């Protein structure tokens, strides 16, 4: 198709490996580019951890208000929100918001702990029909993004279908789904990624991810004005370990998609 030729050209110009999956919820049509190749998820995996905790709260009604200690030993490499509460507590709701909206890595590790380890996050993926997602490590080592390493990867197709189910589908209860959507819409880290390639009137909820090998990711739910919502996943990784992030590639991918 025309969009796939432009995405291929974008990829060639970038020097990296680009993975795109679009789901248009109007006709359930999909646009895929390397849609079945594995990419390192990096912080886009935080959506699955937050959703898993939301799923637990459908039975444990007060779970999101449960205070969790933040100790100095819990801090890892990037803890913008958790740093503000060292030797204090944060609720699981506050930790989920911090993980999603600020990409706080300590918050992610507390969510993983609440689920019983990375295997508990992966379990939730399997329970909602995602046989592709795998979380193997905690923060920050899950971001190593080593070429060919299957750990902590998913495919664009699988992540797009799963993000659809979590936010626009009914994999979560009604209150939980709305909470996830609210969190994603309040993301603070996405302005230069998918959002930058889309018309300013469209409302976006997204989760970015970045890692070694210049890995630059964004997954988004998009509500166009007077049009069925879209789900767009853009994964990008590069051959050099210390390569710089390329959020512009995600913005350009989104712009190419939005042209259709």
Residue numbers in the entry: 28 to 287
What do the authors of the reporting publication say about this deposited model?
To demonstrate the versatility of the method, we have employed two different model systems: a mesophilic enzyme with direct biomedical relevance, and a thermophilic enzyme with industrial implications. Klebsiella pneumoniae CTX-M-14 is a monomeric enzyme that catalyzes the hydrolysis of penicillin-, cephem- and carbapenem-family antibiotics. Streptomyces rubiginosus xylose isomerase (XI, EC:5.3.1.5), is a tetrameric enzyme that facilitates the interconversion of aldoses to ketoses, for example D-xylose into D-xylulose or D-glucose into D-fructose. Here, we show for both systems that a modification of the environmental temperature modulates the underlying structural dynamics as well as the enzyme kinetics.
In order to establish a reliable and accurate method for determining the influence of temperature on the resting state of the CTX-M-14, and XI structures, initial data were collected without triggering a reaction. Five structures of CTX-M-14 were determined at 10 °C, 20 °C, 30 °C, 40 °C, and 50 °C, as well as five structures of XI at 20 °C, 30 °C, 40 °C, 45 °C, and 50 °C. This systematic normalization of all experimental parameters permits a direct side-by-side comparison of the structures and consequently allows to directly assign temperature-induced structural differences. For CTX-M-14 a shift in the ADP distribution and pairwise Cα-RMSD can only be determined above a threshold temperature (ca. 50 °C), corresponding to its in-solution melting temperature. Clearly, both the CTX-M-14 as well as the XI sub-datasets assemble into temperature-specific clusters, emphasising a coherent conformational space that corresponds to environmental temperature. Thus, mapping the torsion angle deviation onto the backbone of the protein structures highlights hinge regions with particular flexibility. In CTX-M-14 these are residues 52-54, 193-196, 226-231 and 251-255, while in XI the region around 25-26, 126-129 and 206-210 shows the largest torsion angle deviation. Taking the general trend into account, the combination of the much higher unfolding temperature of XI in solution, and the gradual increase in ADPs with increasing temperature suggests a different temperature response mechanism of the hyperthermophile XI compared to the mesophilic CTX-M-14. This indicates that the respective response in conformational variability reflects an adaptation to either a mesophilic or a thermophilic temperature optimum, respectively.
